[PDB]
Design a protein around this ligand. Structure first.
Ligand SMILES: NC(=O)c1ccc[n+]([C@@H]2O[C@H](COP(=O)([O-])OP(=O)(O)OC[C@H]3O[C@@H](n4cnc5c(N)ncnc54)[C@H](OP(=O)(O)O)[C@@H]3O)[C@@H](O)[C@H]2O)c1
Ligand SMILES: NC(=O)c1ccc[n+]([C@@H]2O[C@H](COP(=O)([O-])OP(=O)(O)OC[C@H]3O[C@@H](n4cnc5c(N)ncnc54)[C@H](OP(=O)(O)O)[C@@H]3O)[C@@H](O)[C@H]2O)c1
Ligand SMILES: NC(=O)c1ccc[n+]([C@@H]2O[C@H](COP(=O)([O-])OP(=O)(O)OC[C@H]3O[C@@H](n4cnc5c(N)ncnc54)[C@H](OP(=O)(O)O)[C@@H]3O)[C@@H](O)[C@H]2O)c1
Ligand SMILES: NC(=O)c1ccc[n+]([C@@H]2O[C@H](COP(=O)([O-])OP(=O)(O)OC[C@H]3O[C@@H](n4cnc5c(N)ncnc54)[C@H](OP(=O)(O)O)[C@@H]3O)[C@@H](O)[C@H]2O)c1
Ligand SMILES: COc1ccc([C@@H]2CC(=O)c3c(O)cc(O)cc3O2)cc1O
Ligand SMILES: COc1ccc([C@@H]2CC(=O)c3c(O)cc(O)cc3O2)cc1O
Ligand SMILES: COc1ccc([C@@H]2CC(=O)c3c(O)cc(O)cc3O2)cc1O
Ligand SMILES: COc1ccc([C@@H]2CC(=O)c3c(O)cc(O)cc3O2)cc1O
Lengths: 248, 246, 239, 249
């Protein structure tokens, strides 16, 4: 029987490359999405064309609310409904936008802390309660201690995510569930960003003056789920080309 | 005129010691409280006995909800309305209890993440919007070696580190410094003495917990003129506890 | 055709396991040793039987002295002599013993700082001067929670972190990646008490080597300045 | 009696501000120096005219060698000879210069950069503890230790080791009541020979005020860690850099 994996925010960009490589490695995949229905269904088709009955989609909004836990429970239940098991959780979905200290503020809190941290915690709980090489990989941020100006809520959410990574590694280790992270520095840059600003960020990177490809982020995820990382838990692998080492 | 400070969860234990020492240094104080009205008021009366009209109380729940922004805005506003200014914010209030991965879960989230992180964020934003100005957040020296089954608490304290760092950077252009004090084991909970002694015995420096006053002293330093170039720093005050391997 | 790797302290335990796995991935290897000549040779023999002229040995003391730079330069030179190239440097050799604050002390400095930090710096220098290129330093997952009375060893592994980060920055323009692997308790009733603290299964060399193999691979081409803990969660356990 | 402190590299700049501030708080001080004999004596003179028999000087080269342990033992012994006690050690002396990976011999660069920044602190810590109240040790660390300057690998290594020593010695000396902490500047007094334009490049990076720390600001954090207001603090490193370490590339 092939193992199965949930990848959140898997319709595009890094989550898609993660889903692809997991599927190329032998996994069946739940492709979670919020608004990108076309791209999600289109990816599941591409994957099912390669091996039938190996990909489903699952829509959920990952904003914090009093029904977020039932949404998270549903994401994990969909893996067990499609495949009869759930071996890997990848917490990849993320909101990312400025929240200057000087959308209502309670929506910003619900989006940036819900998606980046609370949803991973609830997915983790549902993943653990429903339970072999079981593991969780959280998508962290290499720059979490050198934050972007005016991104306090985002940064808080990614700090919380490190805390979860550690806390869940400790508490879940006696059930055989490993919990780790992968921390991009700059990888695929925002759709909305202009070409001058992208090159400003690209020239800061010591290793090659370029962003990480999505595939490079995925390769680290593939490592942490593999049999070659079976003692690794509570570790966060930076994949940023040295960017976090560069002083102001 | 005397400067003014808000201290959250100031009725008892560490927040009380903080409020007292700020008052001793010449601060006027807003004593924020949630359920401990009697202790908050008894503190404000003692402080006002030392110096008239120097202490007020402000009740608010710091649990995350759609009224939290208005509550935090009101706490800052109460310092301005009482004293004409707000020089210092101490984010001390904290919920602390286990949340095993294996009250509803969304209440746990609102309490643990609200008090420890979202309320500090909202307070920080209101403090800055309304302007030796500084903020001090009460962090946790053990944030990278967390207690088993305290995932939400740990996430809240991690978020608080992120706030400390993010606000320090963003508020440095306004002359507002943002720092933290990270206790290890300080005043312990009704916890049996035999259980207290198991924690005390792990502390290299003296085999004892920090007093509240010892934590307050680091807060006093960070708000002082002796720390005018210090921002984005977190001072551990654990007796070496975080250095001790399993 | 085939890439080549230098592994220090490669005769036994973790370094052997690293050398074996690199060789199994298609590397030619320099097996460095200090006192374990028989074990280095026996390893080289097992590897060369698998594929002829793919494994050589190099003796060198990695204690800091006036001669250490020459020794380090020759380790790298042996890789170039045997194989025509040097793609990977694994700094694995390490001295480990207590040095209470309360052998002369300067000999302790020379071994614990020399082997753990200065020889890695000289090796890294020689390696870069001679040029998928990468260096992997064997770090410590417990560097922040150090063993009681191990101050010099602890200084040496801290220094190795600083080297990892500094060399990642400075060599990145040359396409040389620099990373680390930090084991927890991979041992030299005391043994069983350490085993018992580990979250993940209360318990190999190969597990360390697996992480090294990842960091040298084409799957880590954007990773530099990263230290991968391989500790079963031990570094997360409070006192 | 008044307490006594040793401050290494105390003739000028931050070490001088630290000795001065400790002297202003009531300490008697050992002013260690290497080459700056004139500045050392001139400082001890001013302190002694403020209060007689309260400042001495002590010459030592802190480069690693087979005599370094004896030089470190002698520094500590100077304080006990002059003042009958030694309450505080401040490890402030530091060599600082590039050692590119791709003149001095390499073994001399190792001996100076690792010796002054890490080995001499370890040996001084050992002598301080063996020769033994609010006893403490403060190490001058570097706030930028994880975002290092390009081509400064041996300096960076030395400062990482010093973080290790701060932690290990805090752990091991706690049972004896000796606290060990650090203070970590970002950009404080710029190098004498750095030109103004270059200095201003560094200043402009600092979020809090776009200026370097004064030597006195660094010294304030030292004074705090040695005071009775830091009695439960050991193994902590306080950054004094105006936010510099938080600023991304
Ligand atoms: N790209 C980088 O440079 C970089 C740097 C550091 C860290 N990271 C982290 O690495 C991971 C992947 O990066 P990325 O650029 O691929 O992320 P991304 O494109 O910004 O977002 C990933 C997905 O998250 C989903 N999402 C956003 N808000 C959501 C909500 N309320 N509910 C559910 N899903 C929501 C979106 O799905 P739909 O499109 O279906 O709505 C989105 O496609 C993220 O966690 C990110 O923070 C990325
Ligand atoms: N004691 C320790 O060993 C230790 C260790 C690490 C970190 N810390 C941190 O140091 C700080 C002070 O510690 P402590 O032990 O003195 O704290 P505490 O006694 O646990 O709590 C401080 C105060 O927080 C307030 N609080 C709790 N939930 C609240 C809510 N929903 N809304 C508003 N206020 C709420 C309470 O106010 P009322 O009583 O008025 O309801 C309480 O008196 C905290 O941030 C704590 O996390 C302490
Ligand atoms: N085992 C663990 O649990 C653990 C934990 C933390 C970190 N690590 C690190 O992981 C790496 C490998 O660990 P390990 O237990 O396999 O190491 P180990 O067996 O203690 O030592 C590794 C090698 O270092 C060499 N060595 C020692 N002193 C030397 C000197 N003065 N000159 C030259 N070589 C010298 C030895 O060579 P000869 O036998 O040829 O003389 C030996 O083969 C080390 O860097 C270690 O510090 C290991
Ligand atoms: N300045 C900054 O921006 C900054 C930034 C980060 C960290 N720090 C740290 O803060 C501390 C003070 O900085 P600073 O700028 O005041 O230091 P500094 O002036 O560069 O050096 C301080 C003293 O160290 C002594 N020294 C150098 N090599 C020596 C040797 N081989 N033996 C004995 N002593 C030696 C010198 O004494 P003589 O003059 O008597 O020869 C020198 O006066 C240092 O540890 C430094 O690394 C400073
Ligand atoms: C200096 O710190 C940072 C730099 C760039 C980023 C990138 C920048 C970025 O491209 C990005 C994105 O497209 C999506 C996302 O969810 C998060 C992203 O973060 C994050 C940082 O914390
Ligand atoms: C993982 O190590 C830890 C040990 C003790 C504690 C103490 C234990 C403690 O007494 C305590 C408290 O009473 C209130 C509070 O808000 C936080 C508290 O934390 C926290 C840790 O994170
Ligand atoms: C509490 O911190 C630690 C505990 C054990 C270790 C292990 C203990 C260990 O088994 C070991 C070894 O066999 C060889 C070596 O070079 C280093 C070793 O370190 C390291 C620590 O930093
Ligand atoms: C990016 O990192 C750094 C930037 C500036 C510095 C300063 C720059 C500096 O002025 C300086 C000095 O004058 C003496 C000394 O011993 C160390 C010094 O370091 C250090 C860093 O590690």
């Amino acid at each position: 029987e092939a193992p199965a994996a949930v990848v959140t925010g898997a319709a595009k960009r890094i989550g898609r490359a993660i889903a692809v490589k997991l599927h190329q490695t032998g996994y069946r995949v739940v492709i979670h999405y919020h608004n990108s229905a076309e791209a999600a269904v289109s990816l599941a088709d591409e994957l099912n064309k390669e091996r039938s009955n190996t990909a489903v989609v699952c829509q959920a909004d990952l904003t914090n609310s009093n029904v977020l836990p039932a949404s998270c429970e549903e994401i994990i239940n969909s893996c067990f409904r499609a495949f009869g098991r759930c071996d890997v959780l990848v917490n990849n979905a993320s909101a990312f936008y400025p929240t200057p200290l000087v959308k209502t503020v309670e929506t910003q809190v619900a989006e940036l802390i819900g998606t980046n941290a609370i949803a991973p915690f609830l997915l983790t709980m549902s993943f653990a309660q429903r339970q072999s090489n079981l593991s969780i990989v959280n998508l962290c941020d290499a720059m979490v201690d050198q934050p972007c100006m005016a991104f306090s809520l985002y940064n808080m959410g990614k700090h919380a995510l490190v805390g979860l990574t550690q806390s869940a590694a400790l508490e879940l280790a006696p059930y055989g569930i490993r919990v780790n992270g992968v921390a991009p520095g700059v990888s695929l840059l925002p759709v909305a960003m202009g070409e001058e600003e992208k090159d400003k960020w690209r020239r800061k990177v010591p290793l090659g003056r370029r962003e990480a490809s999505a595939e490079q982020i995925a390769d680290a995820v593939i490592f942490l789920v593999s049999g070659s990382a079976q003692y690794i838990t509570g570790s966060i692998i930076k994949v940023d080309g040295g960017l976090s080492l560069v002083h102001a």
